[PDB]
Write a protein that binds this ligand. Sequence first.
Ligand SMILES: Nc1ncnc2c1ncn2[C@@H]1O[C@H](COP(=O)(O)OP(=O)(O)OC[C@H]2O[C@@H]([n+]3cccc(C(=O)O)c3)[C@H](O)[C@@H]2O)[C@@H](O)[C@H]1O
Ligand code: HEM
Length: 399
Amino acid sequence: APSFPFSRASGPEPPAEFAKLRATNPVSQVKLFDGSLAWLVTKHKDVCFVATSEKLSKVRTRQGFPELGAGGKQAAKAKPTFVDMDPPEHMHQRSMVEPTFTPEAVKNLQPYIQRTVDDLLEQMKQKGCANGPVDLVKEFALPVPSYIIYTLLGVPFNDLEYLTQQNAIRTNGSSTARQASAANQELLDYLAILVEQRLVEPKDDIISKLCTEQVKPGNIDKSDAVQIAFLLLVAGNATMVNMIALGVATLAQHPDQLAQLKANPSLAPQFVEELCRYHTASALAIKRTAKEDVMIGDKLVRANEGIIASNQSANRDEEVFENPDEFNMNRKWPPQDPLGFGFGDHRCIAEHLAKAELTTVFSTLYQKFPDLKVAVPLGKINYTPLNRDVGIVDLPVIF
Ligand SMILES: Nc1ncnc2c1ncn2[C@@H]1O[C@H](COP(=O)(O)OP(=O)(O)OC[C@H]2O[C@@H]([n+]3cccc(C(=O)O)c3)[C@H](O)[C@@H]2O)[C@@H](O)[C@H]1O
Ligand code: HEM
């Protein structure tokens, strides 16, 4: 069994291992950091099965859960929320915050998403780049999703640097156990204060609804509200930042497609679809354990063994997406769903929100800055460590 997770082949590419596995060993065992063996699923059909099987559990502290690092064990000590639940507990709590993320709710949020993007881009225009390139991440990719979720949750914009820093320390593989633990607690303490404020004086935000609709009536306690707020604050935000940055790098890498997008910003939706398939910025989150013996592919997975379903590999499945390793926003989509946002009950609660933010970004960015260019050779882009999910730390640009 090979050590897992695997490292990306190069900055923007997925691990080279997946291709061989899909072709000759689709469901296999891998060796985790603690010496335990877990099952790696690489084919689209199998990942979909894993995401929908009633025989598998999402419970993180359940016996056999496949933590990928020593830090995982500590994170798992967090109070369980819907992301760690199976039916009926799952939807019982997820339904408490789902209203904000429905297709209808996201559609009504469009004017605000547009304004948020418009304002951030205008500031870049005013700051200019006469004295050199600016970091698209810090000035745009970072504040776009951050400001939106902060408004939805009820978090003050001024705390962007602090909250971003603390979560970075918490999830950074280079952080000592102590440093990561302190960071996680600073995040909870911060949100506890906010939840307490809303219990006394509610506003029209997610935290407030949790308070008036669930806490006061005694359906969940104060600590549950804090954990839910924590989950919505930390899950996916950094991933959105990376997706925006990766989208810009991809367009610079595919000049012909950028030309099409500039000529017609209405192509943004299809660009976003290919982006979410090609760059699977969340590739190690679909993890489960078998409640009982069950067949996954042609392999018998025994009760309590861990499973890791790679939606990244599924998105590069050559038996589903033609010429999978080529980025082409003009591809004709097959009947099979791309899995950038997962599948089944746990499919990203913010899928509609995320795609709207990305669609707004890519239908506006080049209209605002038609001459936007990545200011460093593409081969020199500062990507995230190869042993982690694909992303970009900073992206110098001119316009
Ligand atoms: N207190 C602590 N002490 C030591 N290490 C700590 C830590 N807290 C986090 N960490 C480390 O950093 C990682 C932090 O992640 P942890 O909180 O599980 O996960 P992360 O914040 O990504 O996500 C929180 C929850 O959302 C889920 N999710 C699904 C799909 C996409 C995304 C997304 O963010 O795009 C998130 C995810 O599986 C998890 O259940 C851990 O795996 C751990 O190694
Ligand atoms: C483009 C950026 C994003 C990508 C690619 C993404 C991807 C995913 C994937 C693949 C899952 C499934 C995990 C599993 O099945 O185990 C997931 C779950 C989830 N995501 Fe996202 N996500 C993104 C942004 C967000 C944002 C911005 C939020 C914040 C509101 C978010 C909140 C969640 C939550 C709460 C869950 C767990 C839902 C559940 O268990 O029912 N995601 N996401």
